[PDB]
PDB file of C-alpha atoms and ligand atoms in Angstrom:
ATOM      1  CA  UNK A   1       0.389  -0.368  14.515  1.00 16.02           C
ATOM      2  CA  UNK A   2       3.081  -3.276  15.867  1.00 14.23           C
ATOM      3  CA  UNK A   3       0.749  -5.827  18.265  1.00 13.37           C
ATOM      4  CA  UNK A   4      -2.949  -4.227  17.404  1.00 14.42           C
ATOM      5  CA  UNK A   5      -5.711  -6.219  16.909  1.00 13.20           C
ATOM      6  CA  UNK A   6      -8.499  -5.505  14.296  1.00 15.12           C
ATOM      7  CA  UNK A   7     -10.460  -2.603  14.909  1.00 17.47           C
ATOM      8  CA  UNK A   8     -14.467  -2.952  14.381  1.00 16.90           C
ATOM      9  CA  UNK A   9     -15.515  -0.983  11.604  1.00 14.63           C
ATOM     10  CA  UNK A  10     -17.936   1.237  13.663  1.00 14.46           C
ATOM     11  CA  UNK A  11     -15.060   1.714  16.333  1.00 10.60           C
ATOM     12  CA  UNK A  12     -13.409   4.778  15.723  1.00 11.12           C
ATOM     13  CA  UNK A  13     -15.559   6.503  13.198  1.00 12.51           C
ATOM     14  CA  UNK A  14     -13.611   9.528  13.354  1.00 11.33           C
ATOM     15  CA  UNK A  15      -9.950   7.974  11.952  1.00  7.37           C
ATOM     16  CA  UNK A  16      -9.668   9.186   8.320  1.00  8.13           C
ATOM     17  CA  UNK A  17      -6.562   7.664   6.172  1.00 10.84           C
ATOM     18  CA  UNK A  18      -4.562  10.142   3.740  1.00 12.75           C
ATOM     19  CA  UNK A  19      -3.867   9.190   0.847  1.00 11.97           C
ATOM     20  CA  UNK A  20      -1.359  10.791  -1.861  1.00 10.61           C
ATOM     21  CA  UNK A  21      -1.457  10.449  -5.426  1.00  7.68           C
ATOM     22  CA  UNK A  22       1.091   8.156  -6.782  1.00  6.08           C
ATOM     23  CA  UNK A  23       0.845   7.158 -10.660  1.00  9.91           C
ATOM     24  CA  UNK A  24      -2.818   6.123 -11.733  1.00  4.91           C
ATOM     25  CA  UNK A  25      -3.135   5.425  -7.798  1.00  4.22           C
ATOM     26  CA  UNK A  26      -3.976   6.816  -4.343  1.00  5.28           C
ATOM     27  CA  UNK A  27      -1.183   5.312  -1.306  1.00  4.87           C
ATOM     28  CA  UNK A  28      -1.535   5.791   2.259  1.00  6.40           C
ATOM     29  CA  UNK A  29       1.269   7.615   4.163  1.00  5.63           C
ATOM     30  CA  UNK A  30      -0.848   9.285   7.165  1.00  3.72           C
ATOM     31  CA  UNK A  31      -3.455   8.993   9.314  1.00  6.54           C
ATOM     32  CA  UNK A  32      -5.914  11.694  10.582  1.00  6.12           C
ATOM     33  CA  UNK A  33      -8.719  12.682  12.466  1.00  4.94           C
ATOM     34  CA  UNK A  34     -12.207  14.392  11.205  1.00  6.56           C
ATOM     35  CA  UNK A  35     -12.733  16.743  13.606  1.00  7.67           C
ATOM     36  CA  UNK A  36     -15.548  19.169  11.219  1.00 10.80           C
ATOM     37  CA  UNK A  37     -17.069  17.989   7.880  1.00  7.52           C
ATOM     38  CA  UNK A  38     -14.585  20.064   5.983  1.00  8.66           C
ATOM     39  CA  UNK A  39     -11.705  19.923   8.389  1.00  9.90           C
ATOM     40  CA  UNK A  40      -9.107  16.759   9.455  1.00 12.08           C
ATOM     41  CA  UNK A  41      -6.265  17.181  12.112  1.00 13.24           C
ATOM     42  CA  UNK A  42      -3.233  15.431  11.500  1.00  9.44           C
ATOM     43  CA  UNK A  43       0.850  15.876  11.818  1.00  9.38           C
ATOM     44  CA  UNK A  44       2.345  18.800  10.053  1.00 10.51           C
ATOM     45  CA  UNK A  45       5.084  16.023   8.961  1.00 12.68           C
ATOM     46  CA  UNK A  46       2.818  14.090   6.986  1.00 15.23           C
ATOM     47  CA  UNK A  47       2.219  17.064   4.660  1.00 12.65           C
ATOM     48  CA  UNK A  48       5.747  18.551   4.225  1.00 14.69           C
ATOM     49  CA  UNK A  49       5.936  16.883   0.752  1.00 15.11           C
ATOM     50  CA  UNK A  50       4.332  18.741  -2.240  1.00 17.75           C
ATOM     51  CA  UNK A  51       1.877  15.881  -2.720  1.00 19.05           C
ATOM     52  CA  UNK A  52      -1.456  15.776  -4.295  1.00 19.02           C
ATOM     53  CA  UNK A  53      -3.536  14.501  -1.125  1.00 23.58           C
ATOM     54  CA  UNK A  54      -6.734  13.105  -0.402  1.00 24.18           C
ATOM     55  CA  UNK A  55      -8.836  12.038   2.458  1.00 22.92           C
ATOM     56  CA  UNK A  56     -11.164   8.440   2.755  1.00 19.19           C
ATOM     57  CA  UNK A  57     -13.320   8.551   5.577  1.00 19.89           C
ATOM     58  CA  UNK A  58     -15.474   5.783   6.087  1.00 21.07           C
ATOM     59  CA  UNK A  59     -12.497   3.328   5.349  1.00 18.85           C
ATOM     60  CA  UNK A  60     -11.657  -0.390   7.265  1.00 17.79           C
ATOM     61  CA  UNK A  61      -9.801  -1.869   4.138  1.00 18.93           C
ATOM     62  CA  UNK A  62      -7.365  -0.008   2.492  1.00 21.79           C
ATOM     63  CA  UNK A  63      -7.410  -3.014  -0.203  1.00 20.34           C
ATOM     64  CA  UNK A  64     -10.977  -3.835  -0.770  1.00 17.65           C
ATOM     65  CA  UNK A  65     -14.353  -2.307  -0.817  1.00 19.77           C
ATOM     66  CA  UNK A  66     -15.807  -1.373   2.112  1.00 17.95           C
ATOM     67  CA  UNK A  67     -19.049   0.091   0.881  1.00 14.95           C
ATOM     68  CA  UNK A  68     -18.717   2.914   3.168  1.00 16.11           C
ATOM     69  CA  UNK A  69     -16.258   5.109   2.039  1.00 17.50           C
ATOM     70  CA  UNK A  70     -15.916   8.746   0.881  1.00 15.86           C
ATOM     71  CA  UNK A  71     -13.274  10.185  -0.839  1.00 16.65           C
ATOM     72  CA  UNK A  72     -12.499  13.745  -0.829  1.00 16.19           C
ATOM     73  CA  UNK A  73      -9.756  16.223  -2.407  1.00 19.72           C
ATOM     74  CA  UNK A  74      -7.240  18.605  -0.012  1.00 21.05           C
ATOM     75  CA  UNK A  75      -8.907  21.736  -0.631  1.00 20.13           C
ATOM     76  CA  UNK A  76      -6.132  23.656   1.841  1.00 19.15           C
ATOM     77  CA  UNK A  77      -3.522  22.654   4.278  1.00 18.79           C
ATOM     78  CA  UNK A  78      -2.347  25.042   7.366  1.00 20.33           C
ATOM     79  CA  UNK A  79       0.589  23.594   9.414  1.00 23.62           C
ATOM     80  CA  UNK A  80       1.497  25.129  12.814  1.00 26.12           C
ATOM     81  CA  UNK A  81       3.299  28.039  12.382  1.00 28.06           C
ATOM     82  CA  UNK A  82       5.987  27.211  14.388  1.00 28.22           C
ATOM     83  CA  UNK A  83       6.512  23.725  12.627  1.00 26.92           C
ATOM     84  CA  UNK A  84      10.301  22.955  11.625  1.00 26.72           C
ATOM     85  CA  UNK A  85      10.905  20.030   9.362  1.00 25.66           C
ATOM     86  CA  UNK A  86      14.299  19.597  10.555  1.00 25.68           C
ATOM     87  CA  UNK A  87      12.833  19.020  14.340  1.00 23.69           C
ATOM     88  CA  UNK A  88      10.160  16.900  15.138  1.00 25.97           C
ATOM     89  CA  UNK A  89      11.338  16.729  18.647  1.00 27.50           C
ATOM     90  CA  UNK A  90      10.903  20.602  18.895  1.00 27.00           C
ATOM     91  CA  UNK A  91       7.089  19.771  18.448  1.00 27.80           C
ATOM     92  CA  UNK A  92       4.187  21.575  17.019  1.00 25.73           C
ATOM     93  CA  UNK A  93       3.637  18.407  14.860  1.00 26.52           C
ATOM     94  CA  UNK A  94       0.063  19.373  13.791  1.00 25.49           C
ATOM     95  CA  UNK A  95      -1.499  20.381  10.817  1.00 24.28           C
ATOM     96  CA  UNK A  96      -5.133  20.983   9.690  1.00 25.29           C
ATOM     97  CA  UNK A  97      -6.574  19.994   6.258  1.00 26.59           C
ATOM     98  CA  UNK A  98      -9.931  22.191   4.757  1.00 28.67           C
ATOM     99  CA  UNK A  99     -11.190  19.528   2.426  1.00 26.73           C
ATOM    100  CA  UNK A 100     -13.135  20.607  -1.109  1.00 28.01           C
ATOM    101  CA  UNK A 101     -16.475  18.785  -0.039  1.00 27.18           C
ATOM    102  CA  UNK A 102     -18.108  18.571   3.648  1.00 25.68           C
ATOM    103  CA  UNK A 103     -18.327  15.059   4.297  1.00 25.38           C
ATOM    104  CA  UNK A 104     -21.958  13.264   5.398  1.00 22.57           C
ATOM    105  CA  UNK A 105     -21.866  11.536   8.948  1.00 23.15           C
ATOM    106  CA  UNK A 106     -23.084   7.915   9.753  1.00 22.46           C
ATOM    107  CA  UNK A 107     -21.889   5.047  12.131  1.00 24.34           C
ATOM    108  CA  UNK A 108     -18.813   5.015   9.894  1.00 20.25           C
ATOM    109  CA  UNK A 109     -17.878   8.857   9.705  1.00 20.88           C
ATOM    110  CA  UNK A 110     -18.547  11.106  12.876  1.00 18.39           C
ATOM    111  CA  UNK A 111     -16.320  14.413  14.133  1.00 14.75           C
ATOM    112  CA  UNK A 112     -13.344  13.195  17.032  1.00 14.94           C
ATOM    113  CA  UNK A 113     -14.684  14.684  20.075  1.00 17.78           C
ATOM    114  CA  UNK A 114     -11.240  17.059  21.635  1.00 17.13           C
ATOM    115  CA  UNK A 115     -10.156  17.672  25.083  1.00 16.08           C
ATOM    116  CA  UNK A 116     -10.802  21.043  26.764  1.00 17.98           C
ATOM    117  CA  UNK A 117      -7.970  23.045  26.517  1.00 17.93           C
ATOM    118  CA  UNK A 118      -5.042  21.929  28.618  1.00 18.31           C
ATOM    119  CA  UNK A 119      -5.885  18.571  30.194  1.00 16.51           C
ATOM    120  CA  UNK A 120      -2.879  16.548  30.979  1.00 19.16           C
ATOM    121  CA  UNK A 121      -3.592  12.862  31.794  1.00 19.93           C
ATOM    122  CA  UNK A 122      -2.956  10.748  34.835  1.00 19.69           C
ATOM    123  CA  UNK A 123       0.025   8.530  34.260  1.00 21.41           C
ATOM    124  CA  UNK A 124      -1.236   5.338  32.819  1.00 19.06           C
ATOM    125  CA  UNK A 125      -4.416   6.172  31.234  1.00 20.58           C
ATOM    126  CA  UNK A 126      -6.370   4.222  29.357  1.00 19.09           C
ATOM    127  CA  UNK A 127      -5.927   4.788  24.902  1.00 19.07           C
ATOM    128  CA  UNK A 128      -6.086   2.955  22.415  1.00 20.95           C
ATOM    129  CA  UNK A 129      -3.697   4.389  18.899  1.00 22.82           C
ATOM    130  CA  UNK A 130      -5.283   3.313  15.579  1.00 23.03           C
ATOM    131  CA  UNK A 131      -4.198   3.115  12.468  1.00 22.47           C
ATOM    132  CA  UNK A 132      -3.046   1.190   9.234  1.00 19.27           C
ATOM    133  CA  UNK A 133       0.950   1.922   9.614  1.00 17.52           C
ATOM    134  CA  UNK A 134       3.458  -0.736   9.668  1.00 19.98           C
ATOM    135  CA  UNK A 135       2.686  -4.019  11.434  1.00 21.27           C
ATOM    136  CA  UNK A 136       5.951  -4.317  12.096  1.00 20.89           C
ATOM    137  CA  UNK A 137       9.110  -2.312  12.601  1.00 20.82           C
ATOM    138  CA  UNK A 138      10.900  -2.151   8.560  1.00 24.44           C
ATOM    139  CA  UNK A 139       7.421  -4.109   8.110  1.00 27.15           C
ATOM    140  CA  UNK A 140       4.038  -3.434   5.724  1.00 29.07           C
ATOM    141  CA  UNK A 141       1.092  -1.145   6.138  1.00 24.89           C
ATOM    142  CA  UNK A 142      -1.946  -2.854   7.650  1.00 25.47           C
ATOM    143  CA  UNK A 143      -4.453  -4.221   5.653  1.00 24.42           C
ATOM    144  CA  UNK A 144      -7.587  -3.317   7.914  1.00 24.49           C
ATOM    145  CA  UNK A 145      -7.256  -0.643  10.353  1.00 24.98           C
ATOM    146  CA  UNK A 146      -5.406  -1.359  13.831  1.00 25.04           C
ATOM    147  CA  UNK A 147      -5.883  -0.817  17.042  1.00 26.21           C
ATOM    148  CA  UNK A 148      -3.422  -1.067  20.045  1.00 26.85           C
ATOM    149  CA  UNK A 149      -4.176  -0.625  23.764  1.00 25.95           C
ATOM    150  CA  UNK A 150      -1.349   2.386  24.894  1.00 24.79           C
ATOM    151  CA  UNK A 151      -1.523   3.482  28.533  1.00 24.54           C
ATOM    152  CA  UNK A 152      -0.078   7.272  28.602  1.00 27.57           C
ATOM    153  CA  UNK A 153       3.749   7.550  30.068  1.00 26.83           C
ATOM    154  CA  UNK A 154       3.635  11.219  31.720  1.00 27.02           C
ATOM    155  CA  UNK A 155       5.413  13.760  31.669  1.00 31.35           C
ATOM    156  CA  UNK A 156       7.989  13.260  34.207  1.00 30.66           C
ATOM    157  CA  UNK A 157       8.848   9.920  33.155  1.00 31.02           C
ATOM    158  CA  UNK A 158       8.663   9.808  29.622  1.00 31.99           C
ATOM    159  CA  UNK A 159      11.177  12.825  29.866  1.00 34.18           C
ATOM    160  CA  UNK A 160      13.595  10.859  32.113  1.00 36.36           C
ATOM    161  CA  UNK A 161      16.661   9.502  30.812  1.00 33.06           C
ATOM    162  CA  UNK A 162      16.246   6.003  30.412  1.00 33.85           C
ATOM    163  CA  UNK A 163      12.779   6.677  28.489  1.00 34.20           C
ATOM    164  CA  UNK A 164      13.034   9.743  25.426  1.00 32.99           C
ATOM    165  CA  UNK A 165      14.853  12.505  27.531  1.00 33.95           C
ATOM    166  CA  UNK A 166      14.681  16.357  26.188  1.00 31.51           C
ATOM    167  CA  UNK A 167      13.548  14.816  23.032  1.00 30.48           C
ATOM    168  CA  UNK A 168       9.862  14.294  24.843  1.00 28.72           C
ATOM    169  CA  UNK A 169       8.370  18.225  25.324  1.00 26.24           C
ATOM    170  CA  UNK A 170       5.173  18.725  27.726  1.00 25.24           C
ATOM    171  CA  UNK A 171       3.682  19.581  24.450  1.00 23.90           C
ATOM    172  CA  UNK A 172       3.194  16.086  23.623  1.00 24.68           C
ATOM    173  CA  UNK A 173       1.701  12.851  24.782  1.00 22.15           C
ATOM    174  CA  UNK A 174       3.762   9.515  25.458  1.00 19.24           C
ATOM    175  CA  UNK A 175       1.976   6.249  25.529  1.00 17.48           C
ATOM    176  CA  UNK A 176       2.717   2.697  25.290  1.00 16.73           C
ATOM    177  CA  UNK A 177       6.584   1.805  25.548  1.00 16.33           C
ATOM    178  CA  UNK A 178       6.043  -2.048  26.453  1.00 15.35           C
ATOM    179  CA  UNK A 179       8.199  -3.042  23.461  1.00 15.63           C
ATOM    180  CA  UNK A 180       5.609  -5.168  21.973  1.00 13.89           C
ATOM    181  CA  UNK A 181       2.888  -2.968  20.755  1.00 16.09           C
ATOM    182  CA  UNK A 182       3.322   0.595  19.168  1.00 15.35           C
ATOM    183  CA  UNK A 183       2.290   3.256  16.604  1.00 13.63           C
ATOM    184  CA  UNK A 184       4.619   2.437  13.186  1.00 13.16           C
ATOM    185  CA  UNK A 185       5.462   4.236   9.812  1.00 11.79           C
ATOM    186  CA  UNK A 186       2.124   4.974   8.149  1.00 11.50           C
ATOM    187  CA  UNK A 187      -0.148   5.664  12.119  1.00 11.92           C
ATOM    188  CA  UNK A 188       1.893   9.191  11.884  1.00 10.45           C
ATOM    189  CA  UNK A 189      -1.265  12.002  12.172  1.00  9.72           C
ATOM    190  CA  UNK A 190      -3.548   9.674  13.411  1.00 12.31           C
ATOM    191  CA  UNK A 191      -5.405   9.850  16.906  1.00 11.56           C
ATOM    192  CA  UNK A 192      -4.513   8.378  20.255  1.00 11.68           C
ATOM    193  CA  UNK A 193      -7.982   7.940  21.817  1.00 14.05           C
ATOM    194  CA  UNK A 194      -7.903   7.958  25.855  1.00 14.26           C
ATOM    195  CA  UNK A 195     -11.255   7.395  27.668  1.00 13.46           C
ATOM    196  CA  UNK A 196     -12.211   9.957  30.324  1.00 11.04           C
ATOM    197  CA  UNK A 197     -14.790  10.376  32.279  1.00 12.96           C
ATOM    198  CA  UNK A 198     -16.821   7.247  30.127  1.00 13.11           C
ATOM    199  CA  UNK A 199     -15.991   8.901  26.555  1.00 10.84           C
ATOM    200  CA  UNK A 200     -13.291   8.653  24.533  1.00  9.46           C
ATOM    201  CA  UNK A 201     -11.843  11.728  23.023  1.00  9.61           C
ATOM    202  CA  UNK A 202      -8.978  12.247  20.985  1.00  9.55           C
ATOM    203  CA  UNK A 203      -5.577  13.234  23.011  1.00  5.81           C
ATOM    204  CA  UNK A 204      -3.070  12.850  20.617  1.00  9.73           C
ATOM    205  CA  UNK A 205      -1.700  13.124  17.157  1.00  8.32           C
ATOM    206  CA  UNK A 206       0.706  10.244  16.183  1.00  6.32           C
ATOM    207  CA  UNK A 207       4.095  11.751  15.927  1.00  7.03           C
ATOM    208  CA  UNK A 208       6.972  10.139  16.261  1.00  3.94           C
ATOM    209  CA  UNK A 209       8.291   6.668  17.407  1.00  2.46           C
ATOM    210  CA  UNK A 210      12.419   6.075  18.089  1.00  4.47           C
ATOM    211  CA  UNK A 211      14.713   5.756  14.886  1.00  8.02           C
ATOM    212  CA  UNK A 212      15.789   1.945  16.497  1.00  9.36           C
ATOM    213  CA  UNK A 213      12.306   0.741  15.669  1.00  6.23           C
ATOM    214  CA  UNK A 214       8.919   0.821  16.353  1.00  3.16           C
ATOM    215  CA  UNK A 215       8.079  -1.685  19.466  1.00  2.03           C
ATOM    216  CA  UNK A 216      11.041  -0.391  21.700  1.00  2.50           C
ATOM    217  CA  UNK A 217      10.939  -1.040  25.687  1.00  2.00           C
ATOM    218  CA  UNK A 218      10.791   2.843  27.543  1.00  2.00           C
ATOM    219  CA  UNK A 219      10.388   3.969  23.543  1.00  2.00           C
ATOM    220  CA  UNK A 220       6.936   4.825  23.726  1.00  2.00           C
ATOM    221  CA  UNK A 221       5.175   6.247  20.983  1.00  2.00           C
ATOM    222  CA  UNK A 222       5.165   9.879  20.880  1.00  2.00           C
ATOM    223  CA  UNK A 223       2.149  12.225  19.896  1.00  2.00           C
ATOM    224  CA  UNK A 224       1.228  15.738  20.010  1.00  2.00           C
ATOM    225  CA  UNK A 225      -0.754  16.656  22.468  1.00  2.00           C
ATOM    226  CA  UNK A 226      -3.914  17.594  20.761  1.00  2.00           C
ATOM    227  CA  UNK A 227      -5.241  19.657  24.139  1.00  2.00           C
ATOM    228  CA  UNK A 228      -2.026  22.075  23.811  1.00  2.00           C
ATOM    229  CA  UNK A 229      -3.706  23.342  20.573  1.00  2.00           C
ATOM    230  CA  UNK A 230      -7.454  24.086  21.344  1.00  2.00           C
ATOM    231  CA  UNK A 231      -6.642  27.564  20.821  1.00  2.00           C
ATOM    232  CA  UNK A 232      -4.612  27.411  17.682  1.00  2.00           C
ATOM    233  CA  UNK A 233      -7.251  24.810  16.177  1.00  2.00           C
ATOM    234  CA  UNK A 234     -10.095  26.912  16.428  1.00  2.00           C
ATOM    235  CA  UNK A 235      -8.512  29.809  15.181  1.00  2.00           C
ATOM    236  CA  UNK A 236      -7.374  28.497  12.347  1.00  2.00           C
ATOM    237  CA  UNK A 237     -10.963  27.075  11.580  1.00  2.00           C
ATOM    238  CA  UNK A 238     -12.589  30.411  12.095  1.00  2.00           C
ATOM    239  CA  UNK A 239     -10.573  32.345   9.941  1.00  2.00           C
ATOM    240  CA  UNK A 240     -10.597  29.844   7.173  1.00  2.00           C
TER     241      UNK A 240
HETATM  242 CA1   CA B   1     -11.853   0.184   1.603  1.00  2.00          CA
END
């Protein structure tokens, strides 16, 4: 996250970082959301590589012991069906991760709360991305998890041409685009949390940001729109 602040460690309970294995140690490339105790939501991107992956939830530090944390093994990974590698901008940038173990709750670890099915938000809502990606564009990951405050660009303007154009699909959210603050390499899968109606609930998946950086002016950060997929995520859950 480029321009976040801190987050407080009981913020965003929900915000899981995944982790793949990498020598005698565990990296972060992804964020994610716990949305069951056995089941995370995150981008079908972040698990195109034949990784061994985990999931912390519970985590603030990446680099230092938290006392919170729980760390649990990929027990099964479903992408959208209609993912393509190749085309991110095509969408369906979602995937959902059964873990071996169900997780135990606390101020630290709680379920994302979802958006009914369909609900588009008012230009310039209220969300806040979080994450430990890049700091800065070409940058390092975060130390302590980020958060950013990202107003949603809709649909009509984040699709115009000055802003992402056909890249940006009403299958996705856009927020941010000030050129200061932003998602960044490593925030990919994570939520975008909007408040509505005095809760926050989780309306995106982080996505994609533009290939000139990630702080670009009318580049806002793009993420899938998590109430598309209502249908799709509960299916998947209840046949799994
Ligand atoms: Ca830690």
């Amino acid at each position: 996250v480029v321009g976040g602040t801190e987050a407080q460690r009981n913020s965003w309970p929900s915000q899981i970082s995944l982790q793949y294995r990498s020598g005698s140690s565990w990296a972060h490339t992804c964020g994610g959301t716990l949305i069951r105790q056995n089941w995370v939501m995150t981008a079908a991107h972040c698990v195109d590589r034949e990784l061994t992956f985990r999931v912390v939830v519970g985590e603030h530090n990446l680099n230092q012991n938290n006392g919170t944390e729980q760390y649990v093994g990929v027990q099964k990974i479903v992408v959208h069906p209609y993912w393509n590698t190749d085309d991110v901008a095509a969408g369906y940038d979602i995937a959902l991760l059964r873990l071996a173990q169900s997780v135990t709750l606390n101020s630290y670890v709680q379920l994302g709360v979802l958006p009914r099915a369909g609900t588009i938000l008012a230009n310039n809502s209220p969300c806040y991305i979080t994450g430990w990606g890049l700091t800065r564009t070409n940058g390092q990951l975060a130390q302590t998890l980020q958060q950013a405050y990202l107003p949603t660009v809709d649909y009509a303007i984040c699709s115009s041409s000055s802003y992402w154009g056909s890249t940006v699909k009403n299958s996705m959210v856009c927020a941010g685009g000030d050129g200061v603050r932003s998602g960044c390499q490593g925030d990919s899968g994570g939520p975008l949390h909007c408040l509505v109606n005095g809760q926050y609930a989780v309306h995106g998946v982080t996505s994609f940001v533009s290939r000139l950086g990630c702080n670009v002016t009318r580049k806002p950060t793009v993420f899938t729109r998590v109430s598309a997929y209502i249908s799709w995520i509960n299916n998947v859950i209840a046949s799994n």
